[PDB]
Amino acid sequence: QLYTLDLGSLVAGSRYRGDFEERLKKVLKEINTRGDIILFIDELHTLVGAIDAASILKPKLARGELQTIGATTLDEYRKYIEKDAALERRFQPVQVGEPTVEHTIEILKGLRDRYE
Amino acid sequence: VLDQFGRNLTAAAMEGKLDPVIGREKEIERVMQVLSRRTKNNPVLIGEPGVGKTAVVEGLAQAIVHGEVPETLKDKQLYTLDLGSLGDFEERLKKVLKEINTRGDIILFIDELHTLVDAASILKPKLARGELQTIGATTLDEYRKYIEKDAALERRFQPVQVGEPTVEHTIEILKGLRDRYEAHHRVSITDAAMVAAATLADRYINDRFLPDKAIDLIDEAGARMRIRRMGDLDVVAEVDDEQIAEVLGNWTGIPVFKLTEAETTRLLRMEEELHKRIIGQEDAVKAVSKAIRRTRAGLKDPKRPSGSFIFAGPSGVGKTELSKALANFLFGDDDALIQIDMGEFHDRFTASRLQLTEKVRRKPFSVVLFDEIEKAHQEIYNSLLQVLEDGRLTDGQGRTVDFKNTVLIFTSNLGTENDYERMKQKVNDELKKHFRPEFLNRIDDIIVFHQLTREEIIRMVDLMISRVAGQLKSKDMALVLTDAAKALLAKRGFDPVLGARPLRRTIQREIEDQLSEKILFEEVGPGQVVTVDVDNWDGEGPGEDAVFTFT
Amino acid sequence: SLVLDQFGRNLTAAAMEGKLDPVIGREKEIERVMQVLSRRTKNNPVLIGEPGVGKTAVVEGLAQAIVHGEVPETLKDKQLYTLDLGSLVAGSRYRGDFEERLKKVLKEINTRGDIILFIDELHTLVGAGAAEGAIDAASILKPKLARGELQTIGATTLDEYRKYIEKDAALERRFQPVQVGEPTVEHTIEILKGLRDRYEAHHRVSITDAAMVAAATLADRYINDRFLPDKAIDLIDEAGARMRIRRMAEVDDEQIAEVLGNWTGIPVFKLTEAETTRLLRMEEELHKRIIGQEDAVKAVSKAIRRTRAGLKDPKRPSGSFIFAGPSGVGKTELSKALANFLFGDDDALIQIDMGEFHDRFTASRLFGGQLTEKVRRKPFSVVLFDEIEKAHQEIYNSLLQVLEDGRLTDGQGRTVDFKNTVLIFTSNLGDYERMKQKVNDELKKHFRPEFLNRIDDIIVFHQLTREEIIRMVDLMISRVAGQLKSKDMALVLTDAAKALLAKRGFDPVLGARPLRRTIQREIEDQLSEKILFEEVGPGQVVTVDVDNWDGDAVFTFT
Ligand SMILES: Nc1ncnc2c1ncn2[C@@H]1O[C@H](COP(=O)(O)OP(=O)(O)O)[C@@H](O)[C@H]1O
Ligand SMILES: Nc1ncnc2c1ncn2[C@@H]1O[C@H](COP(=O)(O)OP(=O)(O)O)[C@@H](O)[C@H]1O
């Protein structure tokens, strides 16, 4: 199961001091307990900032119990993410390019049914 | 408490978890030099990311455990300090530093020392007291940015450089880590695969650096082999040049046919791949072909640029388009051709800028063009002499720009078969008097272009009118040009002084404009081929009495 | 107290413990520091000196004097605390972290009443905190510095003092300058003799007197990027560390020579001070790369011996020689060989040709410059001046005064010294005795004869004889083979092929410059196209031969 992570859901309602930490640790425990969940954290650049939301994930990502997929703009990657020692060593930039014009034609042909 | 707030490297070596290091003997002995001093005894490792800065520390830990260190470094435990485990922050950091000082035999590895320069309020005085012995790891720009301008640290931190590993060193590193990767992926990797992976990581990849740049390809090929491989079947797997080529094709978006094959054959089918784009200049084509064959093949001095060409001929008559053709073959992109014109650089303030350094650093495997070198500044001349002589560029930033893989073409309008023999004679004469002999003495070759003839100018006309032919096919129309109109349009556009550039104006005025009015007139509009023709003309006159006709 | 510890180190308590290195010969500066520190109002001294002269050493010696008790009553039992601005500037990502930390430090100082600040890098006081207009460290220290209640000791660099402190007159009138100049050779020897005890205790090695003497006398004249005695101490300390890793002994001239050779790349036997014996064998060290010109080699060798002996007046440049003769004789490579012998580096020579720099605007580039910056980076450099015939009168006058006083006053406002610079004027203007009289009358009518008076030697090169051209062909084929031996290609050059190489290479009207072009065209290009088209491959010898002339010619790569 591939789950995308909503940080707003984590941080909403976390009025008490340790509620965010408890929520993130419970999420990580559930992920490592089920053993078949992949994480997709869209906008990986805003992970810093809930102690932070990202600072909880640094010990886990260093030890390899957590596997995540990020998504970032070219400019934001060179400014927010790589400026760390436990992340630049553990994240692999997979470049996704702008589709070619003929590839865009095929993409539009594949989306014809839903718009029609 | 140190294990709860950091990771021990010396204790990890008995477990053997740490990867072996290969070929870092000189940097490790330099690190023991710096660590075995009394002033400036803390080394900082300087190098690009993904070069092996932490590998030097790992090798130091392995050598400490193996017992190849002086008495000062005997039984010294290296501890990588991670900030993730660390009011409470300052006291826990002070407690762990106090425990380090109480032990007295702990050496801290603090990677990315820019994180200090919000712990700077704690570690900076402690290292001032000399009770903390630390190995730092930063890059060159950061070291020249933060540490070098911080006067309080040159008394306590000494730089040691971790340079880029060579190709053979990268191959040896891959051979060393073969056992680890064969164990992890349960795949078998051959030596030719690692040699190919190192070479292609050096050649087609820019954004990373060796040996991370090739170990990534090796790991990616192992992952692909495990994906494509996974009743019972035997374990018969062999990562070879094919898997590495496919992985790099998926990486950099290069098509799978002939991406990595005989570069000799690639250089030898030069002529027809120019001939689909270049017009005429067959002598110039074969001259530049044989020059790039005899210069790029490693027969020239390896500490020099791959080639240096002089393009003699009128401006825009075929030299520049041939440069784009060479860029599209060797390096694959027109934008890979960095466009530098000496007409824009006519003063010292602009000459000192040599928007050229970051462009050639964007792609080291890119062609460098210098247009109209006659009016370049003298500082430009001296920089060109330096670059051609030592094979390097020393920019104002202060980095050695790699120029093995850049090829230089000097595009100029100087001097513009017996007539062409006299042409070449006076071109080299004017390069002996208007220019100076040593600059040409450090030029690989000079080629002088020829004036384009009748069938050459017709083959220019038909290809460039094919642009509006395609634009007209886009409107369910077709365009036909007769030979009489071709010859008359060539005669109208015949200007050997200015070249074929006024032919653009003649095309744009006579053909596209009248056709654009005519399609709006809606008589030779959609649903009919239009065939241009010329009336009131014999085939020899200048064309003042001749009129274009549309059917 | 408890808050100064996280920002600084107690120098007085550390000197009481016995951690501080002793200072040699800084009695005057430390006395001046007590003089300024004893004042009632504005008792703040700032130590101005180049980086690496010992300003922090002066402050530490002051702490050593305070703890023992050789100070007046106004400096007795005063805890000297160092303070760094970087531990306060960093972490100021909010509105008032910097002001809070600095106010806490000042409050602790005022409550203690016996704290003197050694704030290093004083020039960052204006730039710390906010900008220079808003509230910064200067704005919070100035109301208290002027009344002499906050005793502080600053340290800075001369140019940074003139550019940062002197612009702010209110801050400039609050700090008394104390000049700490760069020590000489003998003071550096005394410093090394003082610190030998600490370094031999730390390194477990015995340092001889020749060791410190060699360290100082090599660091002072070879390293110019820093200032003494930081460089000599660095040499001794690095040599001790090298010995300590090699043992798993004693430090002498060999250790210092090898560590400085590692630092600079110059070979070790050069750095050994066998200058006379090196001067004894330089005839073959110069002839090992040059061909013929035996009279020229002898003349330049006796010139080098007469100049480097030190018997002349030490108000002149080391040497100044004119090189006359036709081009292609090898004057440039001779200058390069001289640079290689005298200093050990091929880049130690500067190649400047003024034929492209004619007007005064280009003379501003010349001096006022890359020449000035390179002779400031290293004053022991051979300069090469090509084509002095077409010179402008301003260039003439500047050359006159430069060679006159051994000194150049550039447009940068600096007096750059030329006392050991070797000037080589490779002039193409104008049997051996006859060439003297021909140029003697001709330079005095083209230049002034004060040129010929002030110059040292005129060395005239004759044309290269055919067998010398043959040996030059051998030398160039040697490096061609050196760069192509990677592919196991063996070249044999027959006598007829050598004659063709000589005749297509030697242009008597133009000299022996065009060899480098032709040897790449007539040999390297043909060999390249023969390897590419697979007529010959690796591991086969090619004995190249030629037809059509034995004493239109085609080269056969047999
Ligand atoms: N000489 C070597 N021998 C073996 N492995 C090496 C060597 N140099 C680098 N490596 C490997 O290359 C990888 C790249 O490390 P790097 O990215 O330079 O570390 P950092 O991110 O701290 O700069 C390391 O994991 C290391 O194992
Ligand atoms: N008189 C001296 N006695 C002993 N050591 C000295 C003396 N003068 C300078 N030094 C040494 O020179 C080095 C640089 O001095 P310091 O003032 O700490 O830094 P800088 O001079 O660069 O400001 C110090 O390590 C110090 O030991």
3-state SS, B453-467, equals CHHHHHHHHHHHHHH
DSSP B324-384: HHHHHHHTS-STTSEEEETTT--SHHHHTT---HHHHHH-SS--EEEE-GGG--HHHHHHH
Is the CB of C181 inside 8 Å of chain B's CB atoms? Answer: no
Taking the C-alpha atoms of residue B181 and residue B19, their distance in angstroms, rounded to an integer, is 11
Q: For C402, phi and psi rounded to 5 degrees?
A: -65, -50
Residues 6+ apart with CB under 8 A from B353: B345
Distance, CA B133 to ligand 1 centroid (Å)? 23
Taking the C-alpha atoms of residue A116 and residue A3, their distance in angstroms, rounded to an integer, is 30
Residues 6+ apart with CB under 8 A from B306: B295, B296, B300, B404, B405, B406, B407
Taking the C-alpha atoms of residue C76 and residue C69, their distance in angstroms, rounded to an integer, is 7
> What single-letter DSSP state applies at residue B148?
T
Strand C415-417 to C407-409 pairing: antiparallel
C504, with CB counted inside 10 A (0-12, 13-18, 19+), is middle
Question: Which one of B56, B109, B173 would you pick to mutate in the ligand 1 pocket, going by the greatest count of ligand atoms within 8 A of its CB?
Answer: B173
Distance, CA C198 to ligand 2 centroid (Å)? 14
Taking the C-alpha atoms of residue C13 and residue B158, their distance in angstroms, rounded to an integer, is 27
Angle of CA points C109, C114, C118, to nearest 5°: 70
CA-CA-CA-CA torsion for C248, C250, C251, C257, nearest 10 degrees?
A: -70
Taking the C-alpha atoms of residue C315 and residue C304, their distance in angstroms, rounded to an integer, is 17
Is the CB of B111 inside 8 Å of chain A's CB atoms? Answer: yes
Taking the C-alpha atoms of residue B346 and residue B355, their distance in angstroms, rounded to an integer, is 15
Q: Which of B447, B403, B450, B442 is nearest to B428 (CA)?
A: B447
Ligand 2 atom having least distance to the Cα of C54: 17
Check: CB of residue B334 under 8 Å from CB of residue B438.
no
Q: For B342, phi and psi rounded to 5 degrees?
A: -75, -15
Q: For C505, phi and psi rounded to 5 degrees?
A: -100, -40
- Closest CA of chain C from B286, distance in Å: 13
Distance, CA B198 to ligand 1 centroid (Å)? 14
The residues lining ligand 2, judged by C-beta closer than 6 Å to any ligand atom, are B 39, 155; C 21, 23-26, 51-57, 191, 194-195, 229-230, 233
Are the Cβ atoms of B441 and C524 closer than 8 angstroms?
no
Taking the C-alpha atoms of residue C292 and residue C296, their distance in angstroms, rounded to an integer, is 9
Check: CB of residue B161 under 8 Å from CB of residue B47.
yes
C-alpha distances (whole Å) from C399 to each of C236, C346, C510 are 41, 25, 29
C325 known member of a binding site: yes
What's the sign of the alpha-carbon dihedral C377, C381, C387, C388?
A: positive
Taking the C-alpha atoms of residue A52 and residue A72, their distance in angstroms, rounded to an integer, is 19
Resolution of the experimentally solved model in angstroms: 3.3
* Gaps in chain B after residue (C–N beyond 2.5 Å): 86, 117, 230, 354, 416
Q: Which of B176, B190, B260, B257 is nearest to B225 (CA)?
A: B190
Check: CB of residue B292 under 8 Å from CB of residue B307.
yes
What's the sign of the alpha-carbon dihedral B135, B136, B140, B144?
A: negative
Taking the C-alpha atoms of residue C362 and residue C356, their distance in angstroms, rounded to an integer, is 9
What are the structure tokens assigned to C528, written together? 């390249």
Is the CB of B117 inside 8 Å of chain C's CB atoms? Answer: yes
**Tokens 């005839």, residue?**
C283
What are the structure tokens assigned to B37, written together? 């001093």
Is the CB of B294 inside 8 Å of chain C's CB atoms? Answer: yes
If residue A5 lies in a helix (H) or strand (E), which one and from where to where?
A: none
Check: CB of residue C257 under 8 Å from CB of residue C271.
yes
Question: From start to end of C361-512, where are the E strands?
Answer: 382-386, 407-409, 415-417, 422-426, 457-460, 490-493
Helices marked H in B404-510 — which ranges?
418-433, 437-441, 454-473, 483-492, 501-507
C369 known member of a binding site: no
Check: CB of residue C317 under 8 Å from CB of residue C416.
no
Q: List beta partners, residue B109.
A: B80, B135
Ligand 2 atom having least distance to the Cα of C26: 1
Chain A residue closest in CA terms to B114: A83
- Which residue of C104, C191, C202 is the best one to mutate when testing the B interface, meaning the one whose CB has the most B CBs within 10 A? C202
Order of strands across the sheet with A38-42?
A2-4, A38-42, A68-71
How long a stretch of residues is chain A? Answer: 116
Order of strands across the sheet with B338-341?
B338-341, B368-371, B407-412, B307-312, B445-448
Radius of gyration of chain C (CA): 32
Strand B368-371 to B407-412 pairing: parallel
Angle of CA points B415, B355, B139, to nearest 5°: 135
Q: Cβ atoms within 10 A of the Cβ of C276, count?
A: 10
**Tokens 């990311």, residue?**
B49
Residues 6+ apart with CB under 8 A from C68: none
If residue C2 lies in a helix (H) or strand (E), which one and from where to where?
A: none
Q: List beta partners, residue B341.
A: B371
Angle of CA points C446, C449, C450, to nearest 5°: 130
Q: Whose CA is nearest to atom 25 of ligand 2?
A: C230
C327 known member of a binding site: yes
Taking the C-alpha atoms of residue B158 and residue B44, their distance in angstroms, rounded to an integer, is 6
> What single-letter DSSP state applies at residue B483?
H
What are the structure tokens assigned to B281, written together? 């200049």
Chain B residue closest in CA terms to A51: B84
Q: Establish whether residue B218 lines the binding site of ligand 1, counting it when its CB lies within 6 angstroms of any ligand atom.
A: no
Taking the C-alpha atoms of residue B73 and residue B37, their distance in angstroms, rounded to an integer, is 11
Query: Can you tell me whether residue C12 is helix, strand or coil?
Result: helix
Radius of gyration of chain A (CA): 17
The subunits that touch chain B, with at least 3 C-beta pairs less than 8 Å apart, are A, C
Method used to solve the structure: cryo-EM
**Angle (deg, nearest 10), helices C230-247 and C209-222:** 120
- Ligand located closest to A91 CA: 1
CA atoms within 13 A on the CB side of B477: 22
Chain Cα centroid distance, residue C28: 30
Q: Which of C432, C513, C461, C456 is nearest to C297 (CA)?
A: C461
Order of strands across the sheet with C541-546?
C490-493, C541-546, C555-557
**Pick from B49, B84, B251: which is nearest to A88 by CB?**
B49
Taking the C-alpha atoms of residue B242 and residue B1, their distance in angstroms, rounded to an integer, is 50
Question: Which one of C55, C56, C236 would you pick to mutate in the ligand 2 pocket, going by the greatest count of ligand atoms within 8 A of its CB?
Answer: C56
Taking the C-alpha atoms of residue C330 and residue C490, their distance in angstroms, rounded to an integer, is 28
**Tokens 């605007």, residue?**
C361
Ligand 1 atom having least distance to the Cα of B215: 12
Strand C490-493 to C541-546 pairing: parallel
Are the Cβ atoms of B82 and A55 closer than 8 angstroms?
no
Chain A residue closest in CA terms to B4: A59
Chain Cα centroid distance, residue C397: 27
Three-class secondary structure assignment of B513-539: HHHHHHHHHCCCCCCCEEEEEEECCCC
Q: Cβ atoms within 10 A of the Cβ of C62, count?
A: 29
CA-CA-CA-CA torsion for C36, C37, C38, C40, nearest 10 degrees?
A: 90
C-alpha distances (whole Å) from C18 to each of C14, C56, C68 are 6, 16, 11
Check: CB of residue B404 under 8 Å from CB of residue B305.
yes
Do C and B have ≥3 inter-chain CB pairs under 8 A?
yes
What are the structure tokens assigned to C105, written together? 């430090």
Residues 6+ apart with CB under 8 A from B269: none
Q: Establish whether residue B47 lines the binding site of ligand 1, counting it when its CB lies within 6 angstroms of any ligand atom.
A: no
The subunits that touch chain C, with at least 3 C-beta pairs less than 8 Å apart, are B
If residue B133 lies in a helix (H) or strand (E), which one and from where to where?
A: strand B133-138
Taking the C-alpha atoms of residue C451 and residue C404, their distance in angstroms, rounded to an integer, is 10
Taking the C-alpha atoms of residue B33 and residue B41, their distance in angstroms, rounded to an integer, is 8
Q: For C215, phi and psi rounded to 5 degrees?
A: -60, -50
Chain C residue closest in CA terms to B91: C6
Chain Cα centroid distance, residue B446: 25
Q: Which of C391, C399, C381, C416 is nearest to C454 (CA)?
A: C399
What are the structure tokens assigned to B255, written together? 């098509």
Distance, CA C224 to ligand 2 centroid (Å)? 17
Query: Can you tell me whether residue C130 is helix, strand or coil?
Result: coil
Are the Cβ atoms of A58 and B84 closer than 8 angstroms?
yes
Q: Cβ atoms within 10 A of the Cβ of A91, count?
A: 18
Q: Cβ atoms within 10 A of the Cβ of B510, count?
A: 17
- Which residue of B121, B148, B301, B349 is the best one to mutate when testing the C interface, meaning the one whose CB has the most C CBs within 10 A? B121
Is the CB of B98 inside 8 Å of chain C's CB atoms? Answer: no
Residues in A closer than 8 angstroms to B217, CB to CB, are none
Helices marked H in A7-81 — which ranges?
7-11, 19-34, 53-63, 74-76
If residue B54 lies in a helix (H) or strand (E), which one and from where to where?
A: helix B53-66
What are the structure tokens assigned to C505, written together? 């290479």
Q: Establish whether residue B249 lines the binding site of ligand 1, counting it when its CB lies within 6 angstroms of any ligand atom.
A: no
Check: CB of residue B450 under 8 Å from CB of residue B280.
yes
Taking the C-alpha atoms of residue C139 and residue C377, their distance in angstroms, rounded to an integer, is 39
**Pick from A59, A92, A95: which is nearest to B84 by CB?**
A59
Q: Which of C486, C503, C485, C492 is nearest to C550 (CA)?
A: C503
Is the CB of A9 inside 8 Å of chain B's CB atoms? Answer: no
Residues in C closer than 8 angstroms to B295, CB to CB, are 528
The subunits that touch chain A, with at least 3 C-beta pairs less than 8 Å apart, are B
What are the structure tokens assigned to B543, written together? 């064309």
> What single-letter DSSP state applies at residue C77?
T
Distance, CA C205 to ligand 2 centroid (Å)? 22
